[PDB]
Amino acid sequence: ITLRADRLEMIINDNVSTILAGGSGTGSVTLAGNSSLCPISGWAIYSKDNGIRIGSKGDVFVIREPFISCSHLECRTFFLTQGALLNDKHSNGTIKDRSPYRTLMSCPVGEAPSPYNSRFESVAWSASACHDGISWLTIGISGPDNGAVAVVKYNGIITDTIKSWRNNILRTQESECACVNGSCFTVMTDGPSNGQASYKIFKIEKGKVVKSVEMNAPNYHYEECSCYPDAGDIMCVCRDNWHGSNRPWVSFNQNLEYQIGYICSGIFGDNPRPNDKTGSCGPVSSNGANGVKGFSFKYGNGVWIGRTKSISSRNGFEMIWDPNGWTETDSSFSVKQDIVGINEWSGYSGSFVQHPEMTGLDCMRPCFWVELIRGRPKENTIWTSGSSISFCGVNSDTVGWSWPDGAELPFTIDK
Amino acid sequence: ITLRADRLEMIINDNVSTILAGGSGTGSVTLAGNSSLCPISGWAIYSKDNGIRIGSKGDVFVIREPFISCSHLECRTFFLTQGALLNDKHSNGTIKDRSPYRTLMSCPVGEAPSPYNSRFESVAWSASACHDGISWLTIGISGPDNGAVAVVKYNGIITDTIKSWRNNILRTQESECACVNGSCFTVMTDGPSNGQASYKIFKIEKGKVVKSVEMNAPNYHYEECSCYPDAGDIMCVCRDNWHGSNRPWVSFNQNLEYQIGYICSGIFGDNPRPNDKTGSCGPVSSNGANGVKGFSFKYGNGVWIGRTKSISSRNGFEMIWDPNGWTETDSSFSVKQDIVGINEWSGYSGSFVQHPEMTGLDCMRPCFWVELIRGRPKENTIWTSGSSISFCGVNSDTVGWSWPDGAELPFTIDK
Amino acid sequence: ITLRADRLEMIINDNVSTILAGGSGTGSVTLAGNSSLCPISGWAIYSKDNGIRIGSKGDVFVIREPFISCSHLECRTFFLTQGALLNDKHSNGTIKDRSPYRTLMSCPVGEAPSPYNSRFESVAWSASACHDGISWLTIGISGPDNGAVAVVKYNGIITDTIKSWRNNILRTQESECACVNGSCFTVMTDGPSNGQASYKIFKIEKGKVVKSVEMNAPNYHYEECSCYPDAGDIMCVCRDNWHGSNRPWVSFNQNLEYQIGYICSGIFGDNPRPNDKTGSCGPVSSNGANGVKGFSFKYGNGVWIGRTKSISSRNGFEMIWDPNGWTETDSSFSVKQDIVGINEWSGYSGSFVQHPEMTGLDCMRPCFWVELIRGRPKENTIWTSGSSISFCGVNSDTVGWSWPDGAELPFTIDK
Amino acid sequence: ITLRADRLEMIINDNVSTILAGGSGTGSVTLAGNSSLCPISGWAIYSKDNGIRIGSKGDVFVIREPFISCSHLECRTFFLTQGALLNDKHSNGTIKDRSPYRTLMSCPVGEAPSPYNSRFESVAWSASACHDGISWLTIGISGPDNGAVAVVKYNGIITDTIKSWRNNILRTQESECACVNGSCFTVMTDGPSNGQASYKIFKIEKGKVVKSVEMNAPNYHYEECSCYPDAGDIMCVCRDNWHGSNRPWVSFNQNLEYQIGYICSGIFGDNPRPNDKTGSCGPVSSNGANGVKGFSFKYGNGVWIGRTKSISSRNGFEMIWDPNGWTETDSSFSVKQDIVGINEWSGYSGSFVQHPEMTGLDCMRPCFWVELIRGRPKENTIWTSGSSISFCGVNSDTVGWSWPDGAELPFTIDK
Ligand SMILES: *[C@@H]1O[C@H](CO)[C@@H](O[C@@H]2O[C@H](CO)[C@@H](O)[C@H](O)[C@H]2NC(C)=O)[C@H](O)[C@H]1NC(C)=O
Ligand SMILES: *[C@@H]1O[C@H](CO)[C@@H](O[C@@H]2O[C@H](CO)[C@@H](O)[C@H](O)[C@H]2NC(C)=O)[C@H](O)[C@H]1NC(C)=O
Ligand SMILES: *[C@@H]1O[C@H](CO)[C@@H](O[C@@H]2O[C@H](CO)[C@@H](O)[C@H](O)[C@H]2NC(C)=O)[C@H](O)[C@H]1NC(C)=O
Ligand SMILES: *[C@@H]1O[C@H](CO)[C@@H](O[C@@H]2O[C@H](CO)[C@@H](O)[C@H](O)[C@H]2NC(C)=O)[C@H](O)[C@H]1NC(C)=O
Ligand SMILES: *[C@@H]1O[C@H](CO)[C@@H](O)[C@H](O)[C@H]1NC(C)=O
Ligand SMILES: *[C@@H]1O[C@H](CO)[C@@H](O)[C@H](O)[C@H]1NC(C)=O
Ligand SMILES: *[C@@H]1O[C@H](CO)[C@@H](O)[C@H](O)[C@H]1NC(C)=O
Ligand SMILES: *[C@@H]1O[C@H](CO)[C@@H](O)[C@H](O)[C@H]1NC(C)=O
Ligand SMILES: *[C@@H]1O[C@H](CO)[C@@H](O)[C@H](O)[C@H]1NC(C)=O
Ligand SMILES: *[C@@H]1O[C@H](CO)[C@@H](O)[C@H](O)[C@H]1NC(C)=O
Ligand SMILES: *[C@@H]1O[C@H](CO)[C@@H](O)[C@H](O)[C@H]1NC(C)=O
Ligand SMILES: *[C@@H]1O[C@H](CO)[C@@H](O)[C@H](O)[C@H]1NC(C)=O
Ligand SMILES: [Ca+2]
Ligand SMILES: [Ca+2]
Ligand SMILES: [Ca+2]
Ligand SMILES: [Ca+2]
Ligand SMILES: [Ca+2]
Ligand SMILES: [Ca+2]
Ligand SMILES: [Ca+2]
Ligand SMILES: [Ca+2]
């Protein structure tokens, strides 16, 4: 009697505290992160926000990198803004990219990013964010180029900082971090963008850096990593801004033991890039300098590559299933799904996942977002912004099309 | 002791999980859907949003098909928008109806549809949505005309897709689906809009298509079905765009065994249409081509018909109780309730219900919404939008009137 | 053992259902309404919304009658709008007062009334609203002058209708109804505004009219009643638009047994009115025609009168404690507290209460709101709107001042 | 059996009531307030709202004193506004500071302060606010200069008033009050701003003044106190507007037994001020008249001073760790962290804390906000507003920089 009566008092007191936290929005169980990526045959459109069309009249932030990340209850678009609205003089893009005005904010997926529906996350000109099942982890880097500091928040509260260890533009994913069993993982770079730099993997629990490792990656270059969990490890597919037209990757376990390489497919994933031809398992130097944030999903030895359609500018977007492309160098693939037509503006892209705790599936669902960049330098405006579209992978019927930005430039402020 | 103590631990753990889901908004019990339609004598006004009057100044979407659907806790207006606001250059209506910019969004009933109060649902140029007691089911069709794909979401998460089986503009209700005991039901059409096409009924559980049936309906034409539950079966009243001035219907049980016919009343329900005269239990071909989304409620052999007042254009609206009109061909009715005056713009209309789990009644409450279309082609604007009004059926005193849109066109953007 | 174990299963199942309803916002316990009005010495300012100043630039409704009512968790401003925004052509006030565009909406107390923060309540050109401890009761009258219908909603769902019984502008409080022990009470009038009319008291439970009584009030005239609970009965202080410069009152118990009279004080409470002099316990006919919505609080034989400062137009506002003014005819009072200066625009005013279930007090707290009317006919604008201020009664130190509207007219739209 | 079964019924009934209150947002446990300030080495940026840049186009209040205060679930920016928006004629700053239009409002930290995201708190031209673990305490002073009244609200409900006891501009912190174990503490001043005035400490529980003490502080002057809890006592660092270029402080226990003094450091904290030189433990009269709201944190005999960089106007901002500066008069310090560059506009600043109940730390976290004042009198606009930045103290790596306002003045309304 005393055992069962004391057992009920703990269950009530515990569950009540859980219920009170869940009212404020905090979850009760961490995401396991141990399932493998879902079998899929194609991509179904998930969101489009029409941000720039709406901001022609509405009160909408000029934004960059609208990356998506999901809790176990909702999916949000995170983004960076200079704290200026479309069609206002402050959106003038002469301001440096790494400015003290730059902030990380977020809004529900598919909504135009407005001061009236957007939540403040961090002061940031480079950022990452992800949810561990319990609270949002946000990482916002600000400060001078020679001593930037990433401010780490868990549930909106500052929990750690990470300072530049090379004094040369500390910078991170610009898409979601990856969470497995209560630890979240990101990659940061410090150093040249046109030469060998330094790359670190961070393991973060409740917003505290609990472990970091510097990658030994001579002749590799890592920027703006798209990282996802897969079977309890983390895979990141990144941008080589130094001398790679194919993408670098790094994978690691929860102890930060890692492996590195480049995607071998002759279907080169970066922009700019050469025309497809025999590829390489190291960096493809032809047109390899500069780049664009991107992603890929590894399935065995095959790979789903998302990439621009143009080899030379950020135009079009397509998904390509290359069944041996992770490890083999040919430029043959078996499935292409159009996402944005060749003549249409595209831009950054990144992975995001939906965990089984949210979907009810027994596998890790892969998704991706694309940023559709409008304005300077390609168009005669004073401003630059992106809108977004996103897709999730499904094992059912899908279709290719073109879902472009659709705004008519210039705007009023440009005259 | 061990039985009652273990019985309390399951009740606590179960109810706590329920409470945590209900905090995120998810319900605990599916709608039964087995009650019969309430006895009613007339229609009481429920909402009016004044969307276009407000959007003359406010930041309000240009929208079409503002259909209502209710959970067990709230009623929402779903709608399609091109991602443009009233009084902005992007609202120019040259853009094709089936564009990649078109999205399904929703806002609380009676509020102007704004980016600041509207929730994103799906990328969609044809849509359906309904709530099963637990979560929102949304269906959003996008893609090319020759291979459109309906993306099915349950609680905002992609759960299924349905691809065009005739390659000729897959398209669905543009009003709510119907839910009974945890299964939700919709109708889709693929094929010509001016000839025989193909019509399928879908049964969907937790967002998964669990059964579908192709209707064998030679010489019938089904579009834009208004479907409601009634006594555990589903009734749909639709639009014959081929050769019917009266409306087609299809009814089915939870196993998708169905019946078909046309509303026999000589009070023809479509627009355009002939003047009332002896009707037919098959398609009335006179002025039968083209049409307008509409609805009717069957009560025994009688029918409540909502229809435009004009026989030739989308003007006025009225409710007509025809006590033998479901099965008989005369053009005599017994009650008319004015909704929108003959000289006033109207448009699409559709049914929605309020379930006993929400109302506390012992019957299924019938309601309807009307879209009040302003702008092109009837008026000299660059844009087209609808505002909405809605009514619920009551068995108490009511009154007819005219509740029209009320905006003064043209707007500023039109000059 | 079986008794205590079955007793715990009912408590858990019951409280869980309560918790799930409270998540959606519904309360668990009805307001008792049996306490007497708090002892007070003066009025402390509670809110000011600056609606019209903000709407000079912001997207703010043109509104009338911003009356306040409170649940056990929040206080809201209800208001009527034509569905037009300040500084837009649709705010042109030629439109009839009783139009099909008129709607009852509400927003948090002190916020400018905007489509982006306002909740839709009802289609209405006359309205009442109040909260019984569990859900919002709203009453919205719309329809033609000769057959208007009040639509009654409880928790946003239509529960009853009340149709005009004299075919001559059915109309009600334009401030909150009064709730006692789960029954809510309002007063409606049907008939002439310049002559004897008909007045009914309604008792409403869960949105259902359960009892009504026609008042036998020869030579009295009742409009726009301000009703509050006091010691388990209801007191209403109203507007005599026929031939009374002092205000009529009606009080009743939960069985609708009522008493009637006029406030005897020579401190006349209506506008227009004569200068103070010996008053009357019946209607004071001098300047008695026309009127303004107002209120008073009865304390024994004394009365707190809120009134304009001008005898001839809606300017200024003051609170006056007349310790024998309920029953005596002299024009001497003992305390005046300024609210709006004599040269400043005022307008409608009404009572609202805060119940002990919300305040924790052992008494009924009295409060009032004032509408500050700007624009037509007194000013050269095309529009008319009100902003609001409100005050609660306290038994601690207070101060008089002038808290006026503060907008600078005309606006841009007026030129 | 009867003991354990009755013990479970109380736990369920109690916790359920707690859960229902927590749904409305009310907390269950008061903040202890007994921990000491966290060890820190520097300041990490927490928020920036870019209010004025956004309000160039958006609908954003003209505001002053954007002070932050946190519950156990969120942090908010409180602020005063005249009820006018940026870029509208009503923002013209001729209106007196202490106007009847002035209101205390609040919005989530880092969001531009807009009518669409801001909650109304109080009518106020001087204010304080803080959260005791259970509900928000707000204090809003309005009224005439010769009889102002602070209206005290707890959980949005009026609970007390405090009237001016010297009839000479009653006025308070303009930053958060301090809460310890369910009692909240603030300081108010009544009297001259250029001479000896009167200073009172108030202890407030559930919004009721339970104790007050007049400070005996001859030759001291206290205004706009920044108060924080530290080890179960309260420390306030204030502004001497009479004859002090260093800041006054007052500390007290829960029984309002207090001590007073001035910060001795020759690193003078007020603005205007002399160049640093040997300081004083009493008021430094040189340039001591006038002032700016500010703060400091005491650590043993050392002090963290936040101050403008300019000695003569409100420009720049810096944090200075002076390890003996609380009690010693030298002008040597050991750490400076830049916050706003010398040529950039700054303004008011204040402390706020994050309690262990919110952070999970075992110490009191110190934070501060800075207001970045733009417009009149220093710039050729008709209006004056502030934006804000904030920082929290951390014991990890940080960096100095300049995070200024960034708006380009004049605005459209100024021409
Ligand atoms: C956008 O910003 C740029 C950079 O501030 C502006 O060009 C500057 O204009 C100022 C004064 O107008 C000149 O003194 C500077 O020399 C210009 N800067 C450079 C780098 O050339 C430009 O005018 C802005 N455009 C608009 C439309 O606001
Ligand atoms: C609305 O859109 C139509 C279609 O895009 C516009 O008409 C086009 O205008 C362009 C350039 O102005 C011409 O080159 C095209 O030939 C026109 N198209 C057609 C189909 O005639 C129209 O100008 C737009 N109207 C407004 C007010 O923006
Ligand atoms: C406000 O509304 C009134 C009434 O509709 C307008 O006056 C009408 O104007 C129309 C055309 O402008 C005339 O044909 C009518 O005869 C006028 N009506 C009356 C009753 O005189 C008025 O112009 C509107 N004002 C503004 C600024 O929009
Ligand atoms: C800002 O407000 C001031 C003060 O109200 C305005 O100056 C006043 O203007 C009125 C009429 O324009 C004159 O009669 C007063 O004499 C002026 N007051 C003072 C104190 O000189 C000023 O015009 C306003 N500015 C703008 C741009 O609205
Ligand atoms: C439930 O209530 C009891 C007192 O009746 C209290 O001691 C206990 O802490 C509460 N539990 C929680 C989780 O708040
Ligand atoms: C993943 O982890 C969860 C929870 O820790 C466990 O129940 C599940 O069986 C694991 N699955 C696999 C495939 O390892
Ligand atoms: C309630 O708390 C206990 C631990 O005290 C835990 O095992 C159980 O899972 C909780 N129940 C729920 C539904 O979270
Ligand atoms: C409808 O179903 C519910 C729940 O399954 C049941 O309790 C109820 O009696 C049914 N009513 C009818 C009329 O079949
Ligand atoms: C609690 O859970 C049990 C099943 O474990 C269920 O029968 C019961 O209805 C639930 N109670 C409520 C109020 O939902
Ligand atoms: C009022 O009613 C409540 C609840 O019904 C009761 O507890 C209370 O004692 C009553 N008070 C008076 C003064 O009648
Ligand atoms: C829980 O429910 C019981 C009745 O089943 C009721 O008496 C009790 O007051 C409820 N508890 C709370 C905290 O509402
Ligand atoms: C502070 O108070 C809390 C709660 O009253 C107590 O548990 C804790 O031990 C106290 N800490 C110190 C340092 O006094
Ligand atoms: Ca590259
Ligand atoms: Ca290949
Ligand atoms: Ca037809
Ligand atoms: Ca008939
Ligand atoms: Ca009168
Ligand atoms: Ca008297
Ligand atoms: Ca000073
Ligand atoms: Ca020193």
Author numbering:
A (entry chain A), B (entry chain A), C (entry chain A), D (entry chain A): 55 to 469
Sentences from the paper on this structure:
N1/09 hybrid means residues of loops 01 and 23 of N1/2009 grafted to mSN1 (H5N1/2021) scaffold. Twelve dissimilar residues within Loops 01 and 23 of N1/09 were transferred to mSN1 scaffold to form N1/09 hybrid. The N1/09 hybrid showed an 8°C improvement in its melting temperature Tm to 64.4°C compared to the N1/09 protein (56.4°C), while the Tm of the N1/19 hybrid (72.4°C) surpassed the H5N1 mSN1 scaffold donor (68.7°C). In contrast, CD6 bound strongly to the N1/09 hybrid protein, which had a higher Tm of 64.4°C. CD6 also bound strongly to mSN1 scaffold donor. Seven mAbs which did not bind the mSN1 protein but bound N1/09, also bound to the N1/09 hybrid protein, showing their specificity for the transferred loops. To assess whether loop grafting influenced the local or overall structure of the NA, we determined high resolution crystal structures of mSN1, the N1/09 hybrid, and the N1/19 hybrid. Overlay analysis revealed that N1/09 hybrid and N1/19 hybrid were nearly identical in structure to mSN1, with overall RMSDs of <0.25 Å across equivalent Cα atoms upon overlay. In contrast, the N1/09 and N1/19 hybrids show no noticeable differences between the protomer cavities, all of which closely resemble the wider msN1(ii) conformation, apart from minor, local widening of the rim induced by the substitution of Y344 with an asparagine residue (shown as light-green sticks). Additionally, we observed that the Y344N substitution in the N1/09 and N1/19 hybrids slightly widened the enzymatic cavity compared to msN1. However, N1/09 protein did not induce a cross-reactive response against mSN1, although the N1/09 hybrid did elicit antibodies that inhibited mSN1.
Influenza virus neuraminidase (NA) is an important target for protective antibodies and therapeutic drugs against influenza viruses. NA cleaves off host sialic acids, aiding the release of newly formed virions from infected cells. NA is a mushroom-shaped type II homotetrameric protein. The polypeptide chain of the NA monomeric head folds into six, topologically identical, four-stranded, antiparallel β-sheets which are arranged like the blades of a propeller.
